[PDB]
């Protein structure tokens, strides 16, 4: 379940996580509508937009 970030995302509201373009992340799950993804990176854990990431081998 390893993904890469398509774009920078700046943390904003509740429990979101900043990620940087090209950064690798692990995905734990999704919110109720699937539009937010709960991810882990070396910087921590939190929600990121699901359309800002994609799988990498």
Helix (H, G, I), strand (E, B) or coil at 29: strand
Distance between CA 1 and CA 55 in Å, rounded? Answer: 7
Which residues 6+ apart lie within 8 Å of 23 measured at CB?
A: 4, 5, 41
DSSP 1-34: -EEEESS-B---STTB--B-TT-EEEEEEE-SSS
Judge contact between 42 and 2, C-beta under 8 A.
no
Q: How many domains does the chain have?
A: 1
Element (H or E) spanning 5, and its range?
strand 2-5
Q: What is the resolution of this structure in A?
A: 1.6
Nearest to 16 by CA among 42, 41, 49, 53: 49
Q: Which CATH number is 56's domain given?
A: 2.30.30.40
Residue 14 lies in domain: 1-57
Q: How many residues does the chain have?
A: 57
């Amino acid at each position: 379940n390893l993904f890469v970030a398509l774009y920078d995302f700046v943390a904003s509201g509740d429990n979101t996580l900043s990620i940087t373009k090209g950064e690798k992340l692990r995905v734990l799950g999704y919110n109720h509508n699937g539009e937010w993804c709960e991810a882990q990176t070396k910087n921590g854990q939190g929600w990121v937009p699901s359309n800002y990431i994609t799988p990498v081998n």
